[PDB]
Amino acid sequence: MTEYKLVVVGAVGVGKSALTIQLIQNHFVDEYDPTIEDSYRKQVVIDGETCLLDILDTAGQEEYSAMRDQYMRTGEGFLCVFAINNTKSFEDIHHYREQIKRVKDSEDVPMVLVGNKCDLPSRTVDTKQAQDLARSYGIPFIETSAKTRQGVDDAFYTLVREIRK
Amino acid sequence: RKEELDKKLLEAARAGQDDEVAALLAKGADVNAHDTFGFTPLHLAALYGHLEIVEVLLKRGADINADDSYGRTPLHLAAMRGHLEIVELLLRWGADVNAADEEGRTPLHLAAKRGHLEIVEVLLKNGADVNAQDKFGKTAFDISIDNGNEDLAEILQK
Ligand SMILES: Nc1nc2c(ncn2[C@@H]2O[C@H](COP(=O)(O)OP(=O)(O)O)[C@@H](O)[C@H]2O)c(=O)[nH]1
Ligand SMILES: [Mg+2]
DSSP: OOEEEEEEEEOTTSSHHHHHHHHHHSOOOSOOOTTOOEEEEEEEEETTEEEEEEEEEOOOTTSOOHHHHHHHHHOSEEEEEEETTOHHHHHHHHHHHHHHHHHHTOSOOOEEEEEEOOSOSOOOSOHHHHHHHHHHHTOOEEEOBTTTTBTHHHHHHHHHHHHHO | OHHHHHHHHHHHHHHTOHHHHHHHHHTTOOTTOOOSSOOOHHHHHHHHTOHHHHHHHHHHTOOTTOOOTTOOOHHHHHHHHTOHHHHHHHHHTOOOSSOOOTTOOOHHHHHHHHTOHHHHHHHHHTOOOSSOOOTTOOOHHHHHHHHTOHHHHHHHHO
Protein backbone atom coordinates (compact mmCIF):
# COMPACT_ATOMS: atom_id res chain seq x y z
CA MET A 1 0.00 0.00 0.00
CA THR A 2 1.38 3.39 1.09
CA GLU A 3 3.92 4.02 3.85
CA TYR A 4 4.31 7.27 5.78
CA LYS A 5 7.44 8.49 7.58
CA LEU A 6 6.24 10.61 10.51
CA VAL A 7 8.77 12.38 12.75
CA VAL A 8 7.92 13.54 16.28
CA VAL A 9 10.07 16.49 17.35
CA GLY A 10 10.09 18.80 20.34
CA ALA A 11 11.83 19.63 23.59
CA VAL A 12 12.69 17.10 26.29
CA GLY A 13 9.96 16.03 28.69
CA VAL A 14 7.04 17.24 26.56
CA GLY A 15 5.55 13.76 26.13
CA LYS A 16 6.80 12.49 22.76
CA SER A 17 7.40 8.95 24.01
CA ALA A 18 4.06 8.73 25.82
CA LEU A 19 2.26 10.00 22.72
CA THR A 20 3.72 7.33 20.44
CA ILE A 21 3.25 4.42 22.84
CA GLN A 22 -0.37 5.47 23.45
CA LEU A 23 -1.12 5.29 19.72
CA ILE A 24 0.52 1.88 19.27
CA GLN A 25 0.17 -0.06 22.54
CA ASN A 26 -2.97 1.80 23.76
CA HIS A 27 -1.25 2.30 27.10
CA PHE A 28 0.16 5.19 29.12
CA VAL A 29 3.79 4.66 30.16
CA ASP A 30 4.26 6.73 33.31
CA GLU A 31 8.04 6.97 32.98
CA TYR A 32 10.22 6.34 29.93
CA ASP A 33 13.94 6.71 29.38
CA PRO A 34 14.60 10.24 28.04
CA THR A 35 17.41 9.03 25.74
CA ILE A 36 15.90 6.09 23.82
CA GLU A 37 15.23 6.90 20.16
CA ASP A 38 13.40 4.20 18.22
CA SER A 39 11.16 3.81 15.18
CA TYR A 40 7.85 1.95 15.37
CA ARG A 41 5.45 0.67 12.72
CA LYS A 42 1.65 0.61 12.93
CA GLN A 43 -1.13 -0.51 10.59
CA VAL A 44 -4.21 1.71 10.83
CA VAL A 45 -7.09 2.55 8.49
CA ILE A 46 -7.67 6.24 7.72
CA ASP A 47 -11.07 7.24 6.26
CA GLY A 48 -11.52 3.78 4.73
CA GLU A 49 -8.06 2.87 3.39
CA THR A 50 -5.47 0.89 5.32
CA CYS A 51 -1.91 2.20 5.50
CA LEU A 52 1.42 1.66 7.23
CA LEU A 53 2.88 4.35 9.50
CA ASP A 54 6.62 4.56 10.18
CA ILE A 55 6.91 6.81 13.24
CA LEU A 56 10.23 7.97 14.69
CA ASP A 57 10.32 9.11 18.33
CA THR A 58 13.39 11.33 18.42
CA ALA A 59 15.52 11.62 21.56
CA GLY A 60 19.04 12.68 22.48
CA GLN A 61 19.20 15.67 20.16
CA GLU A 62 22.62 16.90 21.33
CA GLU A 63 24.50 14.09 19.54
CA TYR A 64 24.66 13.46 15.80
CA SER A 65 22.97 10.29 14.55
CA ALA A 66 22.70 8.67 11.13
CA MET A 67 19.16 7.26 11.36
CA ARG A 68 17.79 10.58 12.65
CA ASP A 69 19.50 12.55 9.88
CA GLN A 70 18.11 10.25 7.18
CA TYR A 71 14.66 10.33 8.80
CA MET A 72 14.64 14.14 8.90
CA ARG A 73 15.59 14.42 5.22
CA THR A 74 13.04 11.86 4.01
CA GLY A 75 10.34 12.63 6.59
CA GLU A 76 6.93 13.23 5.04
CA GLY A 77 5.16 14.58 8.13
CA PHE A 78 6.32 16.25 11.33
CA LEU A 79 4.71 16.37 14.76
CA CYS A 80 5.86 19.45 16.70
CA VAL A 81 4.89 18.64 20.28
CA PHE A 82 5.15 21.01 23.23
CA ALA A 83 3.91 21.04 26.82
CA ILE A 84 1.29 23.60 27.86
CA ASN A 85 2.91 24.00 31.29
CA ASN A 86 6.38 24.93 30.01
CA THR A 87 6.98 28.23 28.22
CA LYS A 88 10.53 27.33 27.16
CA SER A 89 9.30 24.29 25.23
CA PHE A 90 6.82 26.44 23.30
CA GLU A 91 9.54 28.92 22.35
CA ASP A 92 11.67 26.02 21.11
CA ILE A 93 9.05 25.19 18.45
CA HIS A 94 10.46 27.88 16.16
CA HIS A 95 13.97 26.45 16.55
CA TYR A 96 12.84 23.00 15.41
CA ARG A 97 10.75 24.45 12.56
CA GLU A 98 13.62 26.41 11.02
CA GLN A 99 15.95 23.40 11.25
CA ILE A 100 13.35 21.23 9.50
CA LYS A 101 12.80 23.99 6.93
CA ARG A 102 16.51 24.10 6.08
CA VAL A 103 16.91 20.31 6.19
CA LYS A 104 13.94 19.71 3.88
CA ASP A 105 14.74 22.87 1.85
CA SER A 106 11.09 23.80 1.32
CA GLU A 107 8.53 26.34 2.50
CA ASP A 108 5.44 24.08 2.64
CA VAL A 109 5.90 20.91 4.70
CA PRO A 110 3.08 18.72 6.10
CA MET A 111 3.08 19.64 9.78
CA VAL A 112 0.74 19.43 12.77
CA LEU A 113 1.25 21.38 16.00
CA VAL A 114 0.55 19.38 19.16
CA GLY A 115 0.04 20.63 22.71
CA ASN A 116 0.50 17.85 25.25
CA LYS A 117 -0.56 17.45 28.89
CA CYS A 118 -4.13 18.67 28.46
CA ASP A 119 -5.21 17.07 31.75
CA LEU A 120 -2.90 19.23 33.89
CA PRO A 121 -4.90 22.28 35.07
CA SER A 122 -1.78 24.37 35.83
CA ARG A 123 -1.82 25.67 32.27
CA THR A 124 0.83 28.25 31.36
CA VAL A 125 0.30 28.53 27.58
CA ASP A 126 -3.16 29.62 26.44
CA THR A 127 -4.98 28.27 23.40
CA LYS A 128 -5.07 31.69 21.72
CA GLN A 129 -1.27 31.98 21.64
CA ALA A 130 -0.85 28.43 20.34
CA GLN A 131 -3.58 28.97 17.74
CA ASP A 132 -2.01 32.27 16.66
CA LEU A 133 1.32 30.53 16.04
CA ALA A 134 -0.42 27.73 14.11
CA ARG A 135 -2.37 30.20 11.97
CA SER A 136 0.80 32.14 11.14
CA TYR A 137 2.52 28.88 10.15
CA GLY A 138 -0.65 27.68 8.42
CA ILE A 139 -0.61 24.29 10.16
CA PRO A 140 -3.43 22.64 12.14
CA PHE A 141 -3.24 22.78 15.93
CA ILE A 142 -4.55 20.06 18.25
CA GLU A 143 -4.64 19.49 22.00
CA THR A 144 -3.56 16.11 23.35
CA SER A 145 -3.22 14.35 26.70
CA ALA A 146 -1.36 11.04 26.77
CA LYS A 147 -2.69 10.35 30.28
CA THR A 148 -6.38 10.26 29.29
CA ARG A 149 -6.02 9.36 25.58
CA GLN A 150 -7.57 12.75 24.78
CA GLY A 151 -7.06 13.43 21.08
CA VAL A 152 -4.17 11.00 20.63
CA ASP A 153 -5.64 9.31 17.55
CA ASP A 154 -6.85 12.57 16.02
CA ALA A 155 -3.30 13.97 16.08
CA PHE A 156 -1.78 11.25 13.90
CA TYR A 157 -4.81 10.87 11.62
CA THR A 158 -4.85 14.61 10.92
CA LEU A 159 -1.16 14.53 9.98
CA VAL A 160 -1.77 11.74 7.46
CA ARG A 161 -4.73 13.67 6.04
CA GLU A 162 -2.37 16.64 5.74
CA ILE A 163 0.15 14.62 3.72
CA ARG A 164 -2.52 13.56 1.21
CA LYS A 165 -3.63 17.17 0.66
CA ARG B 1 10.62 -0.16 51.91
CA LYS B 2 11.73 -3.02 49.67
CA GLU B 3 10.29 -1.26 46.62
CA GLU B 4 12.01 2.03 47.46
CA LEU B 5 15.36 0.22 47.63
CA ASP B 6 14.82 -1.18 44.13
CA LYS B 7 14.07 2.28 42.71
CA LYS B 8 17.45 3.42 44.06
CA LEU B 9 19.21 0.52 42.31
CA LEU B 10 17.69 1.38 38.93
CA GLU B 11 18.81 5.01 39.19
CA ALA B 12 22.31 4.04 40.35
CA ALA B 13 22.77 1.69 37.39
CA ARG B 14 21.54 4.34 34.94
CA ALA B 15 23.71 7.07 36.48
CA GLY B 16 26.80 4.83 36.50
CA GLN B 17 27.74 4.80 40.19
CA ASP B 18 29.86 1.70 40.82
CA ASP B 19 30.03 2.17 44.60
CA GLU B 20 26.28 2.78 44.89
CA VAL B 21 25.33 -0.37 42.97
CA ALA B 22 27.59 -2.62 45.06
CA ALA B 23 26.25 -1.19 48.32
CA LEU B 24 22.60 -1.70 47.34
CA LEU B 25 23.30 -5.17 45.93
CA ALA B 26 24.59 -6.45 49.28
CA LYS B 27 21.69 -4.68 51.03
CA GLY B 28 19.12 -6.99 49.41
CA ALA B 29 18.07 -5.06 46.30
CA ASP B 30 16.53 -7.17 43.53
CA VAL B 31 18.50 -7.43 40.28
CA ASN B 32 15.23 -8.33 38.52
CA ALA B 33 13.39 -5.16 39.59
CA HIS B 34 11.83 -3.18 36.75
CA ASP B 35 10.02 0.09 36.13
CA THR B 36 6.70 0.60 34.33
CA PHE B 37 7.91 -0.36 30.85
CA GLY B 38 10.08 -3.19 32.16
CA PHE B 39 13.64 -1.89 32.13
CA THR B 40 15.75 -3.93 34.54
CA PRO B 41 19.12 -2.69 35.86
CA LEU B 42 20.77 -4.75 33.11
CA HIS B 43 18.65 -2.92 30.53
CA LEU B 44 19.82 0.50 31.73
CA ALA B 45 23.47 -0.41 32.34
CA ALA B 46 23.80 -1.85 28.83
CA LEU B 47 21.98 1.13 27.31
CA TYR B 48 24.07 3.91 28.85
CA GLY B 49 27.41 2.20 28.28
CA HIS B 50 28.67 1.05 31.71
CA LEU B 51 30.73 -2.15 31.53
CA GLU B 52 31.56 -2.96 35.16
CA ILE B 53 27.94 -2.50 36.24
CA VAL B 54 26.87 -5.02 33.60
CA GLU B 55 29.50 -7.50 34.80
CA VAL B 56 28.55 -7.07 38.46
CA LEU B 57 24.83 -7.45 37.74
CA LEU B 58 25.39 -10.58 35.64
CA LYS B 59 27.38 -12.33 38.37
CA ARG B 60 24.74 -11.53 40.99
CA GLY B 61 22.07 -13.27 38.92
CA ALA B 62 20.41 -10.73 36.64
CA ASP B 63 18.45 -12.38 33.84
CA ILE B 64 20.24 -11.96 30.53
CA ASN B 65 17.22 -12.55 28.25
CA ALA B 66 14.69 -10.35 30.04
CA ASP B 67 12.48 -8.19 27.83
CA ASP B 68 10.56 -4.97 28.33
CA SER B 69 7.00 -4.14 27.28
CA TYR B 70 8.08 -4.07 23.62
CA GLY B 71 9.97 -7.37 23.84
CA ARG B 72 13.50 -5.96 23.63
CA THR B 73 16.38 -7.73 25.39
CA PRO B 74 19.53 -6.09 26.79
CA LEU B 75 21.29 -7.15 23.59
CA HIS B 76 18.83 -4.99 21.64
CA LEU B 77 19.60 -1.78 23.55
CA ALA B 78 23.37 -2.29 23.42
CA ALA B 79 23.21 -2.98 19.67
CA MET B 80 21.10 0.10 18.88
CA ARG B 81 23.60 2.32 20.71
CA GLY B 82 26.89 1.02 19.29
CA HIS B 83 28.48 -0.44 22.42
CA LEU B 84 30.97 -2.95 21.03
CA GLU B 85 32.44 -3.87 24.41
CA ILE B 86 29.06 -4.52 26.03
CA VAL B 87 27.61 -6.67 23.23
CA GLU B 88 30.58 -9.04 23.22
CA LEU B 89 30.34 -9.41 27.00
CA LEU B 90 26.61 -10.15 26.68
CA LEU B 91 27.28 -12.80 24.03
CA ARG B 92 30.05 -14.31 26.18
CA TRP B 93 27.52 -15.07 28.94
CA GLY B 94 25.10 -16.88 26.64
CA ALA B 95 22.52 -14.38 25.40
CA ASP B 96 20.01 -14.96 22.62
CA VAL B 97 21.19 -13.52 19.29
CA ASN B 98 17.99 -14.26 17.33
CA ALA B 99 15.46 -12.69 19.69
CA ALA B 100 12.56 -10.69 18.29
CA ASP B 101 10.45 -7.80 19.57
CA GLU B 102 6.77 -7.08 19.02
CA GLU B 103 7.67 -6.00 15.47
CA GLY B 104 9.73 -9.17 14.99
CA ARG B 105 13.07 -7.35 14.76
CA THR B 106 16.45 -9.00 15.41
CA PRO B 107 19.42 -7.19 17.01
CA LEU B 108 20.95 -7.45 13.54
CA HIS B 109 18.00 -5.47 12.14
CA LEU B 110 18.39 -2.67 14.68
CA ALA B 111 22.16 -2.31 14.32
CA ALA B 112 21.99 -2.43 10.52
CA LYS B 113 19.34 0.30 10.36
CA ARG B 114 21.22 2.70 12.65
CA GLY B 115 24.48 2.11 10.80
CA HIS B 116 26.98 0.49 13.21
CA LEU B 117 29.05 -1.79 10.97
CA GLU B 118 31.41 -3.16 13.63
CA ILE B 119 28.44 -4.28 15.74
CA VAL B 120 27.03 -6.07 12.68
CA GLU B 121 30.25 -7.99 12.07
CA VAL B 122 30.24 -9.38 15.62
CA LEU B 123 26.62 -10.56 15.41
CA LEU B 124 27.31 -12.25 12.06
CA LYS B 125 30.26 -14.09 13.63
CA ASN B 126 28.11 -15.56 16.43
CA GLY B 127 25.48 -17.02 14.10
CA ALA B 128 22.85 -14.39 13.32
CA ASP B 129 20.29 -15.53 10.75
CA VAL B 130 20.69 -13.04 7.91
CA ASN B 131 17.63 -14.48 6.16
CA ALA B 132 15.31 -13.30 8.95
CA GLN B 133 12.08 -11.43 8.23
CA ASP B 134 10.11 -9.24 10.62
CA LYS B 135 6.33 -9.17 10.93
CA PHE B 136 6.23 -6.56 8.13
CA GLY B 137 8.42 -8.57 5.75
CA LYS B 138 11.88 -7.01 5.61
CA THR B 139 15.40 -8.40 5.74
CA ALA B 140 18.68 -6.83 6.80
CA PHE B 141 19.61 -6.81 3.11
CA ASP B 142 16.46 -4.81 2.32
CA ILE B 143 17.55 -2.24 4.93
CA SER B 144 20.88 -1.77 3.15
CA ILE B 145 19.15 -1.22 -0.20
CA ASP B 146 16.60 1.18 1.28
CA ASN B 147 19.16 3.20 3.25
CA GLY B 148 21.80 3.07 0.50
CA ASN B 149 24.49 1.44 2.66
CA GLU B 150 27.00 0.02 0.18
CA ASP B 151 29.42 -0.92 2.96
CA LEU B 152 26.68 -2.79 4.82
CA ALA B 153 25.57 -4.43 1.56
CA GLU B 154 29.09 -5.78 0.98
CA ILE B 155 29.17 -7.26 4.49
CA LEU B 156 25.66 -8.70 4.13
CA GLN B 157 26.35 -10.19 0.68
CA LYS B 158 29.65 -11.74 1.80
N1 LIG C 1 -0.03 14.77 33.11
C1 LIG C 1 0.55 14.35 31.97
N2 LIG C 1 1.85 13.95 32.01
C2 LIG C 1 2.48 13.53 30.90
C3 LIG C 1 1.75 13.51 29.63
N3 LIG C 1 2.61 13.05 28.70
C4 LIG C 1 3.79 12.80 29.32
N4 LIG C 1 3.71 13.09 30.63
C5 LIG C 1 4.80 12.95 31.63
O1 LIG C 1 6.00 13.56 31.16
C6 LIG C 1 7.12 12.80 31.61
C7 LIG C 1 8.22 12.79 30.56
O2 LIG C 1 7.66 12.58 29.26
P1 LIG C 1 8.49 11.75 28.17
O3 LIG C 1 7.75 10.49 27.80
O4 LIG C 1 9.87 11.41 28.68
O5 LIG C 1 8.58 12.74 26.91
P2 LIG C 1 9.92 12.80 26.03
O6 LIG C 1 11.04 13.36 26.87
O7 LIG C 1 9.71 13.71 24.84
O8 LIG C 1 10.30 11.42 25.57
C8 LIG C 1 6.61 11.39 31.88
O9 LIG C 1 7.06 10.96 33.17
C9 LIG C 1 5.10 11.49 31.87
O10 LIG C 1 4.57 11.07 33.12
C10 LIG C 1 0.34 13.95 29.66
O11 LIG C 1 -0.35 13.96 28.62
N5 LIG C 1 -0.17 14.35 30.83
MG1 LIG D 1 11.38 9.96 24.70
